């Protein structure tokens, strides 16, 4: 989110931005740790019920703005580390559906 | 009589009310975030009655900036969306707010999104076929009026053009209207769909309802109900045939699962919500034909892990009536629509519904195409010359049949000068019967590309 | 000719084997997800 | 159980009854949903014991 | 007075509050009354836990529908007891000792508590006397033990009950001792069929039947085995009479225990089972045992859920057996009856010391051939038999003939196929399988070996097919 | 642990001991049962941490 | 001001202190077990502030015999261990107590075992090959001097043997200081290592810190921190090159997970603590070389049930510069060291650092082994005769290559009676170039099994009748 905000400042000012996230799976793990330590109810792979939201609201901030707003853009390059090429895991499934 | 926020845990908010004013379940409450950066009005959906005049609610917007003790207002009704002809040509969110013109539709009639399916006596006990005018769909995989159609297709195989074609056909050959429900809609793709429908000029006939991917699970769970409410108003009050689109239904199921997890409910098999089947049934049983008017639904279905036994696709398919597989291979041939005649299917393609002759012609076409697909690998590797003369003539026949399955669509006019064509079901059946018999092999292959009935075939025959 | 027939039979038997194995693998996948959730929720309940 | 009781009334009166359950898979799913909503620990395939 | 009152009802489980100093002991029977019209009855509650504050959690034997909070609960002062003696033979009882075929019968009999400790370890003696059944596969590869414990494992519909009937016919028919059958959570119509069949065969006069079937609360389904075992224990320890104890199905006892544990609020173990699964199973099983000079031959059908042999229930049951026949879905699919998996079944007395050197050698050769065939299945499923070596092709043909010859026309299978069963003497079985393993019948067609008895049947069927032995 | 203590008494007095645990799977199951009955938080396969 | 024990549940103890005297997190408290058989002084580490002047603590010693309400004393600081040149040559436990000389080191400077990692501005990537003399490691998983090296593997695949081999190959000639940390491993192995270091005369340069698998979870959680504190002193203060051997670093995570639920933490996936990655990063980010200060760390990482997708090894992977991944399949084939060439990796295996020839030969070896792995099932079912001539040649080459990647290890003599060998890197590169070119296809594959360089290959081929 810090990187996305820094990039968004430029994007809204007519600049073109490329953001790489390396890796979003580590973010999801950290958020799961926080949610568990706050005793929020877990789901698949112990992830909270809003991990998909965690990644979707981040990734939807990468956009191509209209000419009214300056035509700036932010291109997202999220990185996901699968295990045993398991793309049907929870976080890989979410991010694949999002991008 | 207003409540106050007591607990905030992500999108889940607990609200206390005076003893005599606890809101009903699914009521839409309003709260205010006043912090300058994130100032907004939260819509909360009452999920549970916790007792002691506390209600557990799902926030329809991010709760960031919310403060304990802020006043909560009860609207006295559940989430209500605007209804009427005014919703056509506009984009709404799951809560009925206009996105292309904020404040638009505030004064229309508003319908609660929670409604019951038609009474048992009011359902139609006889299944009916929806004649679309498309040869491949009408013949091989006939659509059910008021039924459900799964749509499968990779990127760039004409799914958007097929949706545009179906919008055109429902609006022109039935005097109907379309509601598009983007469940988990990518904002980029939502804007693309808006602009493309506007350019194609069919946006006037369609109402778009977007529950976008960057929203909390509540709106993604309720957007399908909102779109279905608009469609139900069109079917019941305007007396129209509606065509409802849902993309992606799996994302409706997944949003429901996420909501269940947030509310602390024990997950079911494979981690889905315990009420997966109940929610799917509540959504799907409202897409039906009632007193002569129907809502037909084309729904994009994502199959996790390609596992068709997974609880989500297994539950969804219990309600589906037909399947349309869009094939990259078919599209790469220049055939439109890129409908896979062999992967696709329909439950009403049986003699009892479509009659004996329709079944006979469709089965002959399927057999010929299957044989050609089997011989395709030999053709590619060892060459056509290896095949016998019987196999060569069967291959020519099948190539002509698959070319004739293509059609000049009405959504294709914006891409090519020629306008689209409609083919009556009887004409399609007789034409494909003759083609299978082998009454047009002498004609060239190119004559069968992107045309309608036998008259177009003849004209393109002289033209070549 | 007999080798062609035998290889056609073998390819079809491999089709059937792959289909059965994929079914079993998907059943195992679902069972593992369910069991992981059961363990997670049981631990969470023990701490409730 | 409603259908079974209706049929049992006749059966215990000397009648012959044929009862069809279409289908018990969905009854099992509904009972599992009720059990999970009651927070009963599940077993195989998340089903109650 | 001193009676408690119902405070909580959660299905079969009931919490009862007693005055201080009147809290009933664990496993005591208590009586409550349901007074609603159609469901009026007397509930028997078995005390299961002391919750403190003079509260006891109890397991109801009858459905608690219609029970009200605060109704008086009376403590019988003892545990559930069942009638014992020669009088039980020939009659049908339920878990509580009530006679079903003649209500009121056995009320004057001596009554034994259904809860007792197992025999002292010093009284245990291993049993190794072979029990000849006349089934080729059982007698050869899994010889049963007289006075030992035998089990029949199998998923849904693989033939456990039919094999139990077969063993009742082959063992209990010409049996000098007593027999006790315990229907535990199985079909009621199967209990009726067994009752009628035993009456027809005249074995009923020597048999005591105790039924707690599927449509019973979990408490009854977990105590009926104890009731029948108590009758068997009386016959073993008081009359010094050889006892046959058939149980079908003991997994249902485990399943009812799991349901009760869920209701009792215990934290679940793996796969949702009760934490005390192995302990409950051991407490039950160690009572089923011969002692020095006192023989109980017990035969238990064990259901395997979802064909999963690693499920905790059968997994813990395995350790309590002297002989274990494992019925397999695959063998059943092939049409081989009894659908015994010869590689997964075992017997503690299948060693050269007990069954002799030739019996052991023939059994080991059969097992080796079948194991090699099992290994080669991976190749054969793809390429068929023709890619194997000559040695492996010969072995595969021999193995297919052997696996067909392990099948048999059972006595209890006549009702299904109309074909009378066959009995094969053990010596003939050993001779025949020695001949098979040596390839003396390789020329006969495979179907010649299917559902027959001895070598004479083999000759007749081969001739009818077209090959001469 | 009882067998280990008996063996340890001999081991610490210059003797060589051989101890067979037949088997530790059942000890693990018994410990899991005890821990669950004490309502301690379970881990993988319900075993305690 | 002293506290009192309120709750005891295994290794977790709740202690109530008077208001205003609640100890800080990670403080060491002392309690007494007065029972004669188990009389001792428990060191507890404050883990949580439960509120209401209660703290949840993890015992460093068994709590058997501890009584409720006994006095608990706060030392005012975290667990601290002696540091300095005096630790070298001695054996310590997680708490800093000398085992081979009780009382030794009590007068040394004592450093707290809890410490922040080096500032990011002082971190310099290390790209310098550390030659070992092992063919497979030097060719495919070249180790980094001052870098982080791990040996991944399941139970009993050769991690400890490989660590001992690397102690022999690297530490014996090392000019700096060595620190060995036994974390939740076998006490017998610790005794063997102690005696072996004494025999090799390497012990005088080595500090050994042991917390074994018989110790409670707290000791296994803090032993790695103790050893790393000693190594950090040698790095920052003494300004000398440090070797750090850890076996097994997975035991730190496992001990963390053992007490996680008793601390009130909801379990994460696969039964691990929610803070798996955070604790692992806190420990690992301290195991590093800084600018001009070198720590060559070698860690054995247990892979639970051979599952490399398990959360613990999967999290550990990111912290390493070089990883040698041992396989149960390679092990069961009889190849030793049982390295998985296709799965192992090294960040300095690129042409810039190792040179074009080494990189090309390694890549060709990897390609041949990958193709052989793809063809293995085809060979199993349809047999090798149905492959093409090129595929058959590749299979012969790949079998010879996989055998030649095995080596008679110095530390494996006790398991084979055969003395070990060392192969120089240049010879390894040359020999594997020849193998990939097919210049040894005329020798039986058995000639390549457990040998050193090319001379050993020639001798063994002669013994088998072949000629090289
Ligand atoms: N020896 C046999 N010969 C022929 N058919 C048989 C034989 N054994 C079993 N069957 C068939 O299999 C059916 C199931 O047999 P049985 O009831 O003994 O199985 P089960 O393992 O006890 O089943 P369940 O799990 O339903 O209790 C029988 O009704 C009969 O159809
Ligand atoms: N009936 C048709 N006639 C001509 N071109 C078509 C037709 N259908 C699809 N196409 C072409 O195929 C492409 C498919 O894109 P689209 O329909 O947006 O599907 P998607 O959104 O899945 O990529 C379009 O760019 C369009 O030019
Ligand atoms: N290089 C080798 N040569 C021969 N045997 C070996 C070799 N490495 C390991 N082994 C065998 O494998 C066993 C496991 O090795 P070890 O490293 O102690 O286990 P782990 O990998 O679990 O640490 C050793 O005891 C030894 O018998
Ligand atoms: Mg049965
Ligand atoms: Mg080791």
Helix and strand string of chain C, N-terminal first? H
Separation, N- and C-terminal Cα atoms of chain C? 70 Å
Shape of chain A from CA axes? elongated
Question: Largest interface, counted with CB-CB under 8 A?
Answer: A-B, 22 and 31 residues
- Bound chemical compounds: adenosine-5'-triphosphate, adenosine-5'-diphosphate, magnesium ion
What about the largest sheet of chain C? Answer: none
Instruction: Describe the largest sheet of chain A.
Output: 2 strands, parallel
Gyration radius of chain C (Cα, Å) is 21 Å
Gross morphology of chain C:
rod-shaped
Compute the separation of the termini of chain A in Å: 17 Å
Number of strands of chain C: 0
Structural class of chain A: alpha+beta
Radius of gyration of chain A: 15 Å
**In what range is the share of β-strand residues of chain A?**
5-15%
| H/E element order of chain A | HEHHEH
If helices are DSSP runs of H or I spanning 4 or more residues, what is the number of helices of chain C? 1
Class by helix and strand content of chain C? mainly alpha
What is the number of E strands of chain A? 2
Major sheet strand order of chain A = 1-2
Describe the 3D structure:
Chain C: F-type ATPases have 2 components, CF(1) - the catalytic core - and CF(0) - the membrane proton channel. CF(1) has five subunits: alpha(3), beta(3), gamma(1), delta(1), epsilon(1). CF(0) has three main subunits: a, b and c. Chain C: It is found in: Cell membrane. Chain C: Belongs to the ATPase gamma chain family. This is part of a larger assembly, with 3 copies of chain A, 3 copies of chain B and 1 copy of chain C (48 residues). With 99 residues, chain A is an alpha+beta fold. Helix content of chain A is 42%, strand content 14%. Chain A is built from 4 helices and 2 strands. Chain A has a two-stranded parallel sheet with strand order 1-2. The longest helix of chain A has 14 residues, at 24-37. Chain A is elongated, with a radius of gyration of 15 Å. With 464 residues, chain B is an alpha/beta fold. Helix content of chain B is 35%, strand content 23%. Chain B is built from 12 helices and 19 strands. Chain B has helices at residues 135-140, 159-173, 187-200, 217-236, 249-262, 276-284, 311-317, 328-332, 351-382, 389-405, 425-437, 454-463; strands at residues 3-9, 12-16, 27-33, 40-51, 54-59, 71-78, 80-83, 91-93, 109-112, 129-130, 143-144, 148-153, 177-185, 206-212, 242-247, 289-290, 293-300, 322-326, 345-346. In chain B, strands 8, 12, 13, 14, 15, 16, 17, 18 and 19 form a 9-stranded mixed beta sheet that branches. In chain B, strands 1-2-5-4-3-6 form a 6-stranded antiparallel barrel. A two-stranded antiparallel ribbon of chain B has the order 7-9. In chain B, strand 3 (27-33) and strand 4 (40-51) form a beta hairpin. Chain C is mostly helical. Chain C has 1 helix and no strands. Chain C has one helix spanning 2-46. Classes of the chains: A alpha+beta (99), B alpha/beta (464), C mainly alpha (48). The B-C interface holds B 266-267, 269-271, 305, 307, 309-311 and C 23, 26-27, 29-30, 33-34, 37, 41.
């Amino acid at each position: 989110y810090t990187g996305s905000a820094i990039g968004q400042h430029w994007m809204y000012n007519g600049k073109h931005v490329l953001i790489v996230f390396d890796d979003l799976s580590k973010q999801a793990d950290a958020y799961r740790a926080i949610s568990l330590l706050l005793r929020r109810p877990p789901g698949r792979e112990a992830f909270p019920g809003d991990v998909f939201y965690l990644h979707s609201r981040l990734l939807e901030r990468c956009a191509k703005l209209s000419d009214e707003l300056g035509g700036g853009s932010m291109t997202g390059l999220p990185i996901i580390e699968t295990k045993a090429n398991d793309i049907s895991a929870f976080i890989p499934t979410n991010v694949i559906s999002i991008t | 009589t207003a409540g106050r926020v007591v607990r905030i845990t992500g999108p889940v908010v607990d609200v206390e009310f005076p003893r005599g004013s606890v809101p009903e379940l699914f009521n839409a409450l309003h709260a205010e975030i006043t912090f300058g950066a994130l100032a907004k009005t939260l819509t909360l959906e009452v999920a549970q009655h916790l007792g002691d005049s506390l209600v557990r609610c799902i926030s329809m917007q991010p709760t960031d900036g919310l403060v304990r003790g802020v006043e909560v207002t009860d609207t006295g009704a559940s989430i209500s969306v605007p209804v009427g002809d005014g919703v056509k040509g506009h984009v709404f969110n799951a809560l009925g707010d206009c996105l292309d013109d904020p404040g638009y539709g505030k004064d229309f009639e508003h319908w609660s999104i929670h409604r019951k399916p038609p009474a048992f006596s009011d359902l139609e006990p006889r299944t009916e076929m929806l004649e679309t005018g498309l040869k491949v769909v009408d013949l091989l995989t006939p659509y059910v009026r008021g039924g459900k159609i799964a749509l499968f297709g990779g990127a760039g195989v004409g799914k958007t053009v097929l949706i545009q074609e179906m919008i055109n056909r429902i609006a022109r050959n039935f005097g109907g209207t379309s509601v598009f429900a983007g469940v988990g809609e990518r904002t980029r793709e939502g804007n693309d769909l808006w602009v493309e429908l506007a350019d194609a000029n069919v946006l006037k006939d369609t109402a778009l309802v977007f529950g976008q991917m960057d929203e909390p699970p509540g709106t993604r769970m309720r957007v399908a109900l909102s779109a279905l409410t608009m469609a139900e108003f069109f079917r019941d009050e305007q007396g129209q045939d509606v065509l409802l689109f849902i993309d992606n239904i799996f994302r409706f199921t997944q949003a429901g699962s996420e909501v269940s997890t947030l509310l602390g409910r024990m997950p079911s098999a494979v981690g889905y919500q315990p009420t997966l089947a109940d929610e799917m049934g509540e959504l799907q049983e409202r897409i039906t034909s009632t007193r002569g008017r129907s809502i037909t639904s084309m729904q994009a279905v994502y199959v996790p892990a390609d596992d068709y036994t997974d609880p989500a696709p297994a539950t969804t398919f219990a309600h589906l009536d037909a399947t349309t597989e869009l094939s990259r291979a078919v599209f790469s041939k220049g055939i439109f629509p890129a409908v896979d005649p062999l992967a696709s299917s329909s439950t009403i393609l049986d003699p009892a519904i479509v009659g004996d002759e329709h079944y006979r012609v469709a089965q002959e076409v399927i057999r010929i195409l299957q044989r050609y697909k089997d011989l395709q690998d030999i053709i590619a590797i060892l060459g056509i010359d290896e095949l016998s003369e019987e196999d060569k003539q069967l291959v020519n026949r099948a190539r002509r049949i698959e070319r004739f399955l293509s059609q000049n669509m009405m959504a294709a006019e914006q891409f090519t000068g020629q306008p689209g064509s409609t083919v009556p079901l009887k004409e399609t059946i007789e034409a494909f019967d003759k083609l299978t018999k082998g009454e047009f092999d002498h004609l060239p292959e190119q004559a069968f590309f992107l045309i309608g009935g036998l008259d177009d075939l003849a004209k393109k025959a002289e033209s070549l | 000719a007999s080798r062609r027939r035998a290889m056609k039979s073998a390819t079809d038997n491999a089709d059937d084997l792959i289909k059965a194995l994929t079914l079993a693998a998907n059943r195992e996948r679902q069972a593992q997800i369910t069991q992981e959730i059961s363990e997670i929720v049981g631990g969470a309940n023990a701490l409730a």
